[PDB]
């Protein structure tokens, strides 16, 4: 199948980008105590890997609604001038020519 062909190849360019470490993995509770009482739909790219893998993604839709929801997760919880908002920006950006690239289109 080509779309899994495609979301893999833009999944995994997004998780090898230098501003990806703080998505790789759900973040921990130690890392943010209280986290997950505040964001209602956690979501990381390690989730999204397993999510390719079990062939969840049967559109760009459902790929985009996840990694967009990193990023929402992102700036509801941090600060605009703390270093996890300012990833998700600059990961935002990339992924976003990264689906340009590809040309993904529903
Ligand atoms: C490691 N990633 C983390 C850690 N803490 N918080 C609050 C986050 O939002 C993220 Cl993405």
Redesign the pocket.
């Known amino acids: 199948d080509q779309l899994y062909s495609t979301l893999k190849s833009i999944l995994q360019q997004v998780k090898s980008h230098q501003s990806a ?5 759900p ?2 509770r130690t ?2 105590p209280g ?1 997950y009482e505040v ?1 209602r739909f956690p979501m ?1 790219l390690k989730t999204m890997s397993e999510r390719l893998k079990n062939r969840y993604y049967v559109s760009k839709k459902l790929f985009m609604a996840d990694l967009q929801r ?1 990023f929402t ?2 700036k509801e ?2 600060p605009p001038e ?1 270093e ?1 908002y300012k ?2 920006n600059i990961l935002e950006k990339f992924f976003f020519s990264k689906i340009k690239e590809a040309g993904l289109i529903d």
């Open positions: 470490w703080p998505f790789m993995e973040v921990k890392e943010a986290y964001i990381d990193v997760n992102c919880y941090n703390s996890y990833c998700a």
